[PDB]
Amino acid sequence: TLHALLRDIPAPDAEAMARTQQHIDGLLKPPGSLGRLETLAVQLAGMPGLNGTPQVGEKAVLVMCADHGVWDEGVAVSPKIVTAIQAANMTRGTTGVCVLAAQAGAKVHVIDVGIDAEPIPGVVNMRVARGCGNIAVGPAMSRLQAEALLLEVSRYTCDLAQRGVTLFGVGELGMANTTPAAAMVSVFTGSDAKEVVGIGANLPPSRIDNKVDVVRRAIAINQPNPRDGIDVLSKVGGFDLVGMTGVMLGAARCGLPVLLDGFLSYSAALAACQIAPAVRPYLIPSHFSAEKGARIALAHLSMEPYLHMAMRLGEGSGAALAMPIVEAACAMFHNMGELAASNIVLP
Amino acid sequence: TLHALLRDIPAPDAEAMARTQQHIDGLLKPPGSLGRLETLAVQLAGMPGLNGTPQVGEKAVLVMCADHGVWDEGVAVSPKIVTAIQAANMTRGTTGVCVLAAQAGAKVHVIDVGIDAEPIPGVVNMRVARGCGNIAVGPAMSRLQAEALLLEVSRYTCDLAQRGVTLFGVGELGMANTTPAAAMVSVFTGSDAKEVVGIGANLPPSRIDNKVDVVRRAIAINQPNPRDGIDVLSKVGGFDLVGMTGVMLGAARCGLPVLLDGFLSYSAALAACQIAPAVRPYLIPSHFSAEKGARIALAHLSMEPYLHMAMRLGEGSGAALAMPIVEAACAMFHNMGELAASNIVLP
Ligand SMILES: O=P(O)(O)OC[C@H]1O[C@H](n2cnc3ncncc32)[C@H](O)[C@@H]1O
Ligand SMILES: O=P(O)(O)OC[C@H]1O[C@H](n2cnc3ncncc32)[C@H](O)[C@@H]1O
Ligand SMILES: O=C(O)c1cccnc1
Numbered sequence: 001t002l003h004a005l006l007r008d009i010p011a012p013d014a015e016a017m018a019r020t021q022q023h024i025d026g027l028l029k030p031p032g033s034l035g036r037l038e039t040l041a042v043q044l045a046g047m048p049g050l051n052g053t054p055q056v057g058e059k060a061v062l063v064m065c066a067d068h069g070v071w072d073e074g075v076a077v078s079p080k081i082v083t084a085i086q087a088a089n090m091t092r093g094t095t096g097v098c099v100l101a102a103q104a105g106a107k108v109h110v111i112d113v114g115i116d117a118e119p120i121p122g123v124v125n126m127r128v129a130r131g132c133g134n135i136a137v138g139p140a141m142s143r144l145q146a147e148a149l150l151l152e153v154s155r156y157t158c159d160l161a162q163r164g165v166t167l168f169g170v171g172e173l174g175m176a177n178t179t180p181a182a183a184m185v186s187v188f189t190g191s192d193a194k195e196v197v198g199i200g201a202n203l204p205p206s207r208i209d210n211k212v213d214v215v216r217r218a219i220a221i222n223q224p225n226p227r228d229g230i231d232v233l234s235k236v237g238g239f240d241l242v243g244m245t246g247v248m249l250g251a252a253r254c255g256l257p258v259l260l261d262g263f264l265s266y267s268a269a270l271a272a273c274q275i276a277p278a279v280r281p282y283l284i285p286s287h288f289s290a291e292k293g294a295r296i297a298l299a300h301l302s303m304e305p306y307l308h309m310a311m312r313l314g315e316g317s318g319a320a321l322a323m324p325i326v327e328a329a330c331a332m333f334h335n336m337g338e339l340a341a342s343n344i345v346l347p
Numbered sequence: 348t349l350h351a352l353l354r355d356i357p358a359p360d361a362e363a364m365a366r367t368q369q370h371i372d373g374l375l376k377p378p379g380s381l382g383r384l385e386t387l388a389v390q391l392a393g394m395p396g397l398n399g400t401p402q403v404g405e406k407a408v409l410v411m412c413a414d415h416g417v418w419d420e421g422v423a424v425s426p427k428i429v430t431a432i433q434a435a436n437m438t439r440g441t442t443g444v445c446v447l448a449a450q451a452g453a454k455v456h457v458i459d460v461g462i463d464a465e466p467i468p469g470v471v472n473m474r475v476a477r478g479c480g481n482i483a484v485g486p487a488m489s490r491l492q493a494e495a496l497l498l499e500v501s502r503y504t505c506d507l508a509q510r511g512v513t514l515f516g517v518g519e520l521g522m523a524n525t526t527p528a529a530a531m532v533s534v535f536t537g538s539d540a541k542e543v544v545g546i547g548a549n550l551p552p553s554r555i556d557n558k559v560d561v562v563r564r565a566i567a568i569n570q571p572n573p574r575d576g577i578d579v580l581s582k583v584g585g586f587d588l589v590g591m592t593g594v595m596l597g598a599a600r601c602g603l604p605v606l607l608d609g610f611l612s613y614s615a616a617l618a619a620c621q622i623a624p625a626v627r628p629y630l631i632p633s634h635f636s637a638e639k640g641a642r643i644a645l646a647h648l649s650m651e652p653y654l655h656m657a658m659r660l661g662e663g664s665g666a667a668l669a670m671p672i673v674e675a676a677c678a679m680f681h682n683m684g685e686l687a688a689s690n691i692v693l694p
């Protein structure tokens with residue numbers, strides 16, 4: 001059951017974290033001089049799946065692909081078919097996340113949770129339906145469908161842990177998905193749609209007004225409950241967004257770290273933390289999306305991204321780009337010399 | 348002569364940059380969606396030493412080490428000997444920059460431009476003197492000494508280019524060096540000392556007032572000319588700071604990119620750009636130093652760091668941490684597929 005899953009998410013190991021902090025303080029450098037790299041190492045040390053120490057074994061980026069019915073409301077400029085096309089390209093390694101993941105030594109897992117097209121060979125099949133319902137006139141899916149996908153994705157995720165994966169990255173693919181993402185952010189943060197609706201994948205500025213209106217309509221018609229993350233996801237979210245939330249719950253249950261990506265991932269993280277606050281300690285920010293509603297989303301998650309690249313591609317491209325940073329924290333921890341060894345004393 | 352050197356710094360190749368932009372726009376993604384990663388690739392494409400395309404061959408981090416006479420004014424908490432000790436540790440690979448450089452596949456070059464101690468085996472010897480003069484009572488060095496080191500370091504730098512190095516990172520080591528760095532920033536930016544003097548390597552807050560006073564005294568007594576970068580460096584700078592400036596001039600003359608590090612590097616970059624504006628196009632920011640005067644320095648250099656890690660170690664540790672980002676831009680450029688190949692059309 002999902003209740004068991006949520007109930008079994010482990011709390012951070014404070015004992016391992018204390019030993020980490022002490023060790024970092026004794027390294028060949030002025031105490032605290034490596035700033036957020038030190039904080040990151042301690043965070044990792046508290047994750048039970050890492051065996052009491054900051055370490056990175058195998059790396060995987062999970063890309064959840066699906067189509068959205070709200071695409072018919074004219075909120076996206078790319079043809080709907082671009083989702084299926086790009087999902088296929090993911091298997092050929094020519095996409096942005098594939099190239100960056102290869103650069104970071106990570107494997108890309110492409111999962112189809114609801115693409116509106118024939119099944120794509122090479123893509124993991126977990127499709128709920130051929131595209132989710134149009135949120136502007138009703139819910140994206142039933143609560144049952146949402147919970148089922150959460151469970152399936154979380155199981156898939158923690159199963160990879162048995163294959164040596166210790167670091168996850170989340171990603172997505174789905175034309176028009178920045179619309180339900182904005183709706184969710186508006187609902188969870190209590191912000192007006194206008195403040196969190198962006199241009200997504202180059203939406204013309206003249207078409208923004210319509211996008212804001214669609215978001216408002218979706219909310220008014222569905223009346224999602226902000227205190228129920230599953231309610232929000234099933235009503236104004238999408239299969240892809242649900243899948244991303246599932247990776248976060250899965251990794252957390254597995255006691256492992258997850259790298260967030262951009263705007264879509266922020267909306268999924270808001271939902272995950274609402275569903276289970278215990279997931280928070282396992283989330284690691286990557287970059288600061290150029291999407292309008294990024295600042296608001298990040299503020300509610302109390303997260304400060306490490307990378308400011310004005311990126312807005314999605315796919316988990318930002319998550320892959322940050323993996324080297326996580327490895328750097330581990331390298332610092334394990335490979336630096338110690339002050340005592342050089343007889344140096346620094347207050 | 349130094350005049351020849353400065354005169355021969357090549358301008359960016361606009362033709363190669365135009366071809367770069369066109370290619371990036373045709374990649375398998377919404378135009379401009381990779382933000383600053385795209386801008387970085389184009390910048391690299393314009394650097395003549397890279398052969399008309401964003402590419403990274405061998406990587407090197409140059410660490411300029413030297414002691415400062417102003418240390419006697421009580422502006423630093425670490426014993427003066429820590430410079431020599433850490434410089435030795437650089438040869439053993441136990442320091443922060445060594446670990447991060449190894450993680451990025453870069454080689455660390457440790458250069459002694461003025462450590463106040465016996466020569467250290469394994470360290471490149473270019474020492475001007477055993478520590479520079481105390482800037483609080485007079486100049487750090489003579490103009491002649493400054494120009495000579497600039498020339499020597501710039502030659503060493505461009506010579507590495509012949510060994511396959513295509514990407515440089517700058518670093519330093521020198522107890523009390525954030526004092527002359529603050530003086531230089533104050534002079535070049537016209538900001539008051541109080542606004543740019545930080546805690547350096549954990550200087551107690553109760554000792555900050557004295558540091559501000561020392562900086563003011565150095566400026567009042569030396570009267571450095573803001574319009575003459577060499578004048579400023581020789582008067583209120585240090586051998587290490589001069590050396591960093593030399594790496595920047597050298598790489599620029601070689602038509603190659605240089606990654607800045609933190610606060611000390613910002614002061615050296617201000618000087619380099621004053622000496623020769625043509626150097627600017629070759630400078631690449633890495634992280635946003637936690638030092639107080641960082642914001643002001645970066646504003647005058649019109650640079651926005653990619654990494655926000657609250658780092659303040661120095662040594663070129665931030666520069667090494669950003670190398671993977673430069674390689675990512677190259678990977679994007681060369682390895683992504685093209686829109687035309689998938690028959691996809693995106694405005
Ligand atoms: O709401 P919007 O405006 O449609 O933007 C969301 C989509 O843009 C991104 N995206 C990611 N890869 C893409 N390849 C082509 N087009 C878009 C792409 C993201 O992954 C989604 O597919
Ligand atoms: O002006 P301040 O307060 O002395 O700070 C500047 C120094 O701190 C950094 N630094 C870099 N490595 C160090 N190892 C030990 N101590 C300091 C260190 C930097 O490289 C300089 O050596
Ligand atoms: O921040 C993102 O991940 C993003 C922003 C716009 C369009 N697609 C993805």
Ligand SMILES: O=C(O)c1cccnc1
Nearest residue numbers: 547609610636659660661
């Ligand atoms: O920004 C830096 O590089 C820095 C700041 C403080 C002390 N040492 C180095």
